[PDB]
Design an enzyme around this catalytic site. Structure first.
Site, PDB file in Angstrom:
ATOM      1  N   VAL A   7       0.768  -1.182   0.188  1.00  0.00           N
ATOM      2  CA  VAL A   7      -0.033   0.048  -0.065  1.00  0.00           C
ATOM      3  C   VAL A   7       0.823   1.121  -0.015  1.00  0.00           C
ATOM      4  O   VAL A   7       1.937   1.225   0.576  1.00  0.00           O
ATOM      5  CB  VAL A   7      -1.089   0.122   1.095  1.00  0.00           C
ATOM      6  CG1 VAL A   7       0.063   0.230   2.515  1.00  0.00           C
ATOM      7  CG2 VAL A   7      -1.906   1.132   1.062  1.00  0.00           C
ATOM      8  N   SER A   8       0.639   2.183  -0.721  1.00  0.00           N
ATOM      9  CA  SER A   8       1.288   3.568  -1.121  1.00  0.00           C
ATOM     10  C   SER A   8       0.654   4.461   0.251  1.00  0.00           C
ATOM     11  O   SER A   8       1.259   5.182   1.213  1.00  0.00           O
ATOM     12  CB  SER A   8       1.145   3.968  -2.132  1.00  0.00           C
ATOM     13  N   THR A   9      -0.663   4.900   0.042  1.00  0.00           N
ATOM     14  CA  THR A   9      -1.433   5.750   0.906  1.00  0.00           C
ATOM     15  C   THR A   9      -2.667   6.057   0.473  1.00  0.00           C
ATOM     16  O   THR A   9      -3.408   6.388   1.381  1.00  0.00           O
ATOM     17  CB  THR A   9      -0.522   7.403   1.041  1.00  0.00           C
ATOM     18  OG1 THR A   9      -1.381   8.100   1.661  1.00  0.00           O
ATOM     19  CG2 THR A   9      -0.332   7.431  -0.616  1.00  0.00           C
ATOM     20  N   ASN A  13      -3.859   3.415  -5.886  1.00  0.00           N
ATOM     21  CA  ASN A  13      -2.810   2.339  -6.336  1.00  0.00           C
ATOM     22  C   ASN A  13      -2.539   1.217  -5.534  1.00  0.00           C
ATOM     23  O   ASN A  13      -1.347   0.762  -5.480  1.00  0.00           O
ATOM     24  CB  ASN A  13      -1.607   3.124  -6.372  1.00  0.00           C
ATOM     25  CG  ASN A  13      -1.075   4.060  -5.262  1.00  0.00           C
ATOM     26  OD1 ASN A  13      -0.840   3.086  -4.443  1.00  0.00           O
ATOM     27  ND2 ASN A  13      -0.736   5.351  -5.418  1.00  0.00           N
TER      28      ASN A  13
END
EC number: 3.1.22.-
Length: 188
Positions: A7-9, A13
């Site tokens: 997970v990025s934020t 994505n």
DNA sequence: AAGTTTTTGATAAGTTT
DNA sequence: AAAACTTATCAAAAACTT
């Protein structure tokens, strides 16, 4: 035969790495977050525990990932340690069996150079900044005018366990001259 | 953010009148 | 001679820099 997701934020994505392995014919899911301080695997830290120390691992985006700084290569070299390698799809990074292993084994072990010379580049903006304009080291808290001051204290009537009180130097510094009291050998 | 180079400092290496 | 005592190793440091 495992499976992991990063997970990025944003949840924009996330589905990119999520169902990215939806057909990777894995066996285990490992979702996590970074919201906190990514300095201590803020998510799914036990994936390395209940892992198949014998069979390969699973994770795909070395891009968006905890993989950071000089250490990203330091401890990641634990794949060759047990019984795994890599072989994602977003980055078909050559890995898996010896086909990639010993072909990207000197890509992480020889990865030294990738930044091993930054040991010079970095020393450039420093070995230069040096010259005569600011060295760049612990600033002296003791002044020269206060150093030679004790140059005649304990030479006329001042002891030792008393010369230092208003100064409050250290518990090892102080003595930087001739002998004092019998016996030798350091430690501090 | 992976560095130095100075100039520093609380814990661990050490006797014999 | 036992642990007083002055040491010469070990972090964190405040200065800075790629």
């Amino acid at each position: 035969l495992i499976g992991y997701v990063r997970v990025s934020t944003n949840d924009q994505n996330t589905d990119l790495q999520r169902n990215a392995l939806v057909c990777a014919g894995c066996e285990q899911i490992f979702e996590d977050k970074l919201s906190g301080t990514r300095t201590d695997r803020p998510g799914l830290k036990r994936a390395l525990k209940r892992l198949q120390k014998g069979d390969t691992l699973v994770v795909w985006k070395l891009d968006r990932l905890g993989r950071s700084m000089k250490h990203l290569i330091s401890l990641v070299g634990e794949l060759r340690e047990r019984g795994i390698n890599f072989r994602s799809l977003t980055d078909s990074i050559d890995t898996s069996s010896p086909m990639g292993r010993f072909f990207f084994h000197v890509m992480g072990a020889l990865a030294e150079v990738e930044r091993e010379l930054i040991i010079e580049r970095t020393m450039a903006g420093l070995a230069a900044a040096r010259n005569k304009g600011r060295i760049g080291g612990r600033p002296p808290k003791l002044t020269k005018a206060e150093q030679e001051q004790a140059g005649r204290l304990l030479a006329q009537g001042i002891p030792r366990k008393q010369v230092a009180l208003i100064y409050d130097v250290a518990l090892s510094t102080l003595y930087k001259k001739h002998p004092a009291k019998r016996a030798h050998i350091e430690n501090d």
